[PDB]
Amino acid sequence: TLPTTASSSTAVASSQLDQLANFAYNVTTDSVAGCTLQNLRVRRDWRAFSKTQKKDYINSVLCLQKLPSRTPAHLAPGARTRYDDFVATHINQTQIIHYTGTFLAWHRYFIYEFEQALRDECSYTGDYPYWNWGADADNMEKSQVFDGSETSMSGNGEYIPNQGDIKLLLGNYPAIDLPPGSGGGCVTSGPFKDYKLNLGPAALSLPGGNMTAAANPLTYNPRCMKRSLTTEILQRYNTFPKIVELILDSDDIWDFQMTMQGVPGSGSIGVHGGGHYSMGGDPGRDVYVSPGDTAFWLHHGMIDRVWWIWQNLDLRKRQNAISGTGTFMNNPASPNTTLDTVIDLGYANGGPIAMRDLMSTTAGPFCYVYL
Amino acid sequence: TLPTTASSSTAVASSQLDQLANFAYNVTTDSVAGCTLQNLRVRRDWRAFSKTQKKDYINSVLCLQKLPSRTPAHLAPGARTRYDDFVATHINQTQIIHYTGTFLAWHRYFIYEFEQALRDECSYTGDYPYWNWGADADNMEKSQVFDGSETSMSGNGEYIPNQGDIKLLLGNYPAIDLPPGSGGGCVTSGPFKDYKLNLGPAALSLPGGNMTAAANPLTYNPRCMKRSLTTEILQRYNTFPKIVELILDSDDIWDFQMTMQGVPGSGSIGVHGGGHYSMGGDPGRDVYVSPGDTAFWLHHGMIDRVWWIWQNLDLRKRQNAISGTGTFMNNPASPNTTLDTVIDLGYANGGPIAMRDLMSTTAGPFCYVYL
Numbered sequence: 001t002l003p004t005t006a007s008s009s010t011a012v013a014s015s016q017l018d019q020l021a022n023f024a025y026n027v028t029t030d031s032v033a034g035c036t037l038q039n040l041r042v043r044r045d046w047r048a049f050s051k052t053q054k055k056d057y058i059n060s061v062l063c064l065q066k067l068p069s070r071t072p073a074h075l076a077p078g079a080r081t082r083y084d085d086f087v088a089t090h091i092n093q094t095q096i097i098h099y100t101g102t103f104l105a106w107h108r109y110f111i112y113e114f115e116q117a118l119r120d121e122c123s124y125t126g127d128y129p130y131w132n133w134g135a136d137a138d139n140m141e142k143s144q145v146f147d148g149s150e151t152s153m154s155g156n157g158e159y160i161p162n163q164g165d166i167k168l169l170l171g172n173y174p175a176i177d178l179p180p181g182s183g184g185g186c187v188t189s190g191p192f193k194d195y196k197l198n199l200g201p202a203a204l205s206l207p208g209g210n211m212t213a214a215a216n217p218l219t220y221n222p223r224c225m226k227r228s229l230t231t232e233i234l235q236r237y238n239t240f241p242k243i244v245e246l247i248l249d250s251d252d253i254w255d256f257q258m259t260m261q262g263v264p265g266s267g268s269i270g271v272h273g274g275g276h277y278s279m280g281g282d283p284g285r286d287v288y289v290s291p292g293d294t295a296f297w298l299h300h301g302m303i304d305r306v307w308w309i310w311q312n313l314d315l316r317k318r319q320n321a322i323s324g325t326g327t328f329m330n331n332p333a334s335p336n337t338t339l340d341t342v343i344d345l346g347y348a349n350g351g352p353i354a355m356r357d358l359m360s361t362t363a364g365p366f367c368y369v370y371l
Numbered sequence: 372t373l374p375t376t377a378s379s380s381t382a383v384a385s386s387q388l389d390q391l392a393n394f395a396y397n398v399t400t401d402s403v404a405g406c407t408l409q410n411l412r413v414r415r416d417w418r419a420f421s422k423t424q425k426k427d428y429i430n431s432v433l434c435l436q437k438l439p440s441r442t443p444a445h446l447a448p449g450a451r452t453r454y455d456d457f458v459a460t461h462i463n464q465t466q467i468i469h470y471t472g473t474f475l476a477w478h479r480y481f482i483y484e485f486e487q488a489l490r491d492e493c494s495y496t497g498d499y500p501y502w503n504w505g506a507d508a509d510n511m512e513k514s515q516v517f518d519g520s521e522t523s524m525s526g527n528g529e530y531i532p533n534q535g536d537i538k539l540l541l542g543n544y545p546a547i548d549l550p551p552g553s554g555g556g557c558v559t560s561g562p563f564k565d566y567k568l569n570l571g572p573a574a575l576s577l578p579g580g581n582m583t584a585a586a587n588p589l590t591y592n593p594r595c596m597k598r599s600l601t602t603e604i605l606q607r608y609n610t611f612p613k614i615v616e617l618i619l620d621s622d623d624i625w626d627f628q629m630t631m632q633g634v635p636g637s638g639s640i641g642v643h644g645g646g647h648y649s650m651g652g653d654p655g656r657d658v659y660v661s662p663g664d665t666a667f668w669l670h671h672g673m674i675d676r677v678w679w680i681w682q683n684l685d686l687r688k689r690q691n692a693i694s695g696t697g698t699f700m701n702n703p704a705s706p707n708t709t710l711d712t713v714i715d716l717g718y719a720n721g722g723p724i725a726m727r728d729l730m731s732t733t734a735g736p737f738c739y740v741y742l
């Protein structure tokens with residue numbers, strides 16, 4: 001049988017998670033015959049990628065970072081690459097894709113279409129990778145995603161000493177304080193050391209409490225990607241126990257999505273805010289520009305995975321479950337999201353698509369499972 | 372001497388307000404010499420306009436509702452008139468002009484530039500009118516702004532019986548419930564009965580709790596202006612006592628602007644939400660499209676007046692006082708508004724202008740006082 005209450009023990013909570021995942025795997029695989037068992041893709045933990053498989057993915061990303069942008073220049077003047085096309089649409093729609101009813105599904109579609117670009121333009125034929133926070137929550141620096149080696153998404157940034165805390169303001173609420181991490185500057189190694197971040201900053205939190213906001217975040221501001229790896233953040237918000245609490249203690253989609261994102265006032269930023277902010281730097285600390293950090297795709301692989309596990313714990317009730325509205329924290333108010341709500345990624349990839357077609361990983365345009 | 376504590380008595384609170392206003396008038400007039408006593412314009416209560424003066428203003432508005440729109444068609448396809456130019460920019464910027472640091476100053480500049488259009492394109496040579504809520508708080512229908520006569524901003528809409536309540540959601544907070552008023556449909560008389568509302572709805576609250584949101588609120592949706600005059604709303608939020616509480620019990624700009632707008636969770640929508648929602652209808656109940664209702668300009672004349680009174684109670688401390696950020700309720704987070712923050716009305720009128728130049732009615736582009 002499955003666990004119903006999350007343990008505080010790291011070792012078991014991991015295996016607790018593993019059981020819940022296998023269950024989710026079972027329901028998904030044996031429910032599939034569009035999507036069939038034959039063309040069912042499997043998304044996999046980055047650790048499970050052999051060296052060359054890691055590099056294949058990385059090279060496909062680098063490829064999208066070389067191919068020219070399709071976005072009409074006058075709409076995103078700072079866009080240069082196909083990768084920017086994805087970053088631009090995210091910055092463009094930030095206000096309607098976080099703390100909305102569409103949060104989970106939009107991101108699921110976002111990473112899927114990113115994947116399609118890798119496959120259709122950059123010859124990627126491997127599996128979509130995800131970053132399992134829990135395994136790295138004691139040492140982010142040793143994460144295979146962030147260790148600075150040739151198979152990381154680059155690693156830490158130039159150490160900058162004595163930086164002030166990050167002070168996160170969700171609305172008018174009291175700030176959540178976070179340490180500045182052990183980096184600060186440009187990433188010093190790894191495949192993306194010469195990657196040029198072109199857009200933003202739109203809302204970049206700085207050590208000290210400041211925030212940098214370009215006049216127009218879609219205009220040209222070429223600079224390095226910065227990181228400040230911050231283990232304390234992961235161990236505060238992204239441990240296996242926190243992951244399993246999120247899954248086991250959320251009886252509806254509202255509680256799920258809110259707990260995952262961090263409910264304002266609780267002093268908590270969830271596994272989702274945890275994973276983003278643990279990267280530090282730029283656009284690591286910019287809610288709008290975050291896809292500009294290459295780790296984003298793996299992070300959201302894991303977000304999608306966690307959502308998919310949760311859905312399968314109760315597929316009758318949860319598969320199509322939606323809650324929230326079309327505006328960030330419903331500010332200003334907007335209508336409830338419904339199964340007919342249409343989302344899109346502008347010029348990044350794919351076309352407009354209704355929520356109903358996004359709710360399942362093995363329906364609509366989707367045919368994948370997480371291992 | 373001035374009152375420091377608001378009375379609960381309507382008669383005195385009115386005169387309490389009158390004293391505070393004369394004081395504000397005194398400080399403003401005798402501080403002026405750009406702006407001098409010579410070219411100092413006076414803005415006046417609508418009741419103080421003689422019949423022909425009322426009509427002159429109305430005709431100038433009707434004029435802007437006939438002259439063709441300047442907004443690049445591809446940016447606001449639904450725009451037809453110079454009046455739409457103003458409505459379009461408001462819908463366009465709603466998310467950064469309410470519950471922001473720029474709320475008060477942006478609107479002050481917005482109505483000033485509207486006034487400039489009336490004068491420069493529609494030969495208006497009279498005074499800017501404002502709507503004093505307090506005097507009408509017992510019978511909105513008898514308001515000279517809304518009595519349906521030829522000198523109103525049109526009046527009530529076709530009565531629609533048995534409409535459900537309005538259910539206002541500020542974020543995730545519990546709904547504030549309001550009665551549906553005594554209208555519902557198209558305005559039945561007055562100068563604007565054949566006025567065609569072209570934009571929205573963007574976020575239109577409906578009796579019953581529903582909300583109508585066009586896919587693109589800047590596209591073409593020509594329809595009548597609707598109203599449902601609702602006295603109970605004015606007497607709940609816009610009485611002379613409520614006005615004087617707002618002015619006397621707000622010791623800083625944050626408290627002022629928040630109390631005026633209604634702080635979320637308090638079950639109160641302030642004199643500002645009160646004045647808007649008392650109109651009912653469409654775009655009366657649409658925070659984005661509200662300038663589409665012609666009364667908007669008078670309402671915000673009074674908003675500006677109330678702010679101006681408050682500033683002059685303590686001109687040393689309050690004249691340049693700013694608080695808040697660049698995003699609706701700071702969702703998502705943005706940097707603090709500062710005196711260097713630039714605002715603009717797109718294609719409506721005027722150019723970009725910094726907050727510092729908006730803080731005083733007798734500095735920057737401004738040279739007016741309220742009587």
Ligand SMILES: *[C@@H]1O[C@H](CO)[C@@H](O[C@@H]2O[C@H](CO)[C@@H](O[C@@H]3O[C@H](CO)[C@@H](O)[C@H](O)[C@@H]3O)[C@H](O)[C@H]2NC(C)=O)[C@H](O)[C@H]1NC(C)=O
Pocket residue numbers: 073074075215216442446447459460463464589717718
């Ligand atoms: C609503 O607000 C947005 C944001 O301010 C406005 O977007 C702005 O649109 C204008 C016109 O497209 C852009 O100006 C520039 O015009 C020149 C032509 O002279 C063109 O070559 C440029 O590439 C660009 O189009 C401006 O970049 C853009 N601003 C931002 C920050 O995106 C929009 O106009 C507003 N909508 C309405 C109806 O006013």
Ligand SMILES: *[C@@H]1O[C@H](CO)[C@@H](O[C@@H]2O[C@H](CO)[C@@H](O[C@@H]3O[C@H](CO)[C@@H](O)[C@H](O)[C@@H]3O)[C@H](O)[C@H]2NC(C)=O)[C@H](O)[C@H]1NC(C)=O
Pocket residue numbers: 071075076088089092093218346347444445446586587
């Ligand atoms: C960010 O989001 C906004 C809102 O979706 C996007 O605005 C959209 O811009 C496109 C392109 O200008 C508009 O499409 C239309 O294109 C035809 C040409 O085929 C033109 O004739 C039309 O007048 C119009 O320009 C579309 O109306 C507009 N959508 C809305 C709701 O405003 C914007 O493209 C996004 N920015 C980025 C970088 O993706």
Ligand SMILES: *[C@@H]1O[C@H](CO)[C@@H](O)[C@H](O)[C@H]1NC(C)=O
Pocket residue numbers: 019020022023026
């Ligand atoms: C998944 O299915 C397999 C194969 O039938 C079964 O052995 C295993 O116990 C299942 N796991 C869970 C958690 O249900």
Ligand SMILES: *[C@@H]1O[C@H](CO)[C@@H](O)[C@H](O)[C@H]1NC(C)=O
Pocket residue numbers: 209210211694695707
């Ligand atoms: C922004 O303003 C608030 C109060 O108005 C202040 O407490 C806060 O520290 C400011 N933030 C920064 C980084 O200036």
Ligand SMILES: *[C@@H]1O[C@H](CO)[C@@H](O)[C@H](O)[C@H]1NC(C)=O
Pocket residue numbers: 206208210
């Ligand atoms: C943050 O903003 C404050 C206020 O302008 C400024 O004094 C300080 O230099 C800034 N800190 C840094 C170094 O980013």
Ligand SMILES: *[C@@H]1O[C@H](CO)[C@@H](O)[C@H](O)[C@H]1NC(C)=O
Pocket residue numbers: 390391393394397
């Ligand atoms: C305004 O100034 C006039 C003229 O000096 C004075 O008579 C009046 O008392 C003043 N009103 C207030 C409230 O200060």
Ligand SMILES: *[C@@H]1O[C@H](CO)[C@@H](O)[C@H](O)[C@H]1NC(C)=O
Pocket residue numbers: 323324336580581582
């Ligand atoms: C929107 O959804 C919430 C709960 O998800 C519900 O309570 C509310 O009544 C809905 N509003 C409308 C008008 O459908």
Ligand SMILES: *[C@@H]1O[C@H](CO)[C@@H](O)[C@H](O)[C@H]1NC(C)=O
Pocket residue numbers: 577579581
């Ligand atoms: C409001 O929305 C609900 C849910 O779709 C619908 O059943 C009802 O007809 C709507 N009410 C009206 C008449 O606007």
Ligand SMILES: *[C@H]1O[C@H](CO)[C@@H](O)[C@H](O)[C@@H]1O
Pocket residue numbers: 008009010011134137138235239240
């Ligand atoms: C197991 O290790 C985790 C970190 O991965 C801790 O959070 C937990 O308390 C236990 O020590």
Ligand SMILES: *[C@H]1O[C@H](CO)[C@@H](O)[C@H](O)[C@@H]1O
Pocket residue numbers: 379380381382505508509606610611
């Ligand atoms: C004076 O009248 C006002 C309405 O204008 C009331 O709110 C007040 O209680 C007093 O009766």
Ligand SMILES: [Cu+2]
Pocket residue numbers: 090097098107
């Ligand atoms: Cu996102």
Ligand SMILES: [Cu+2]
Pocket residue numbers: 272276290300
């Ligand atoms: Cu994210």
Ligand SMILES: [Cu+2]
Pocket residue numbers: 461468469478
């Ligand atoms: Cu407004």
Ligand SMILES: [Cu+2]
Pocket residue numbers: 643647661671
């Ligand atoms: Cu208003």
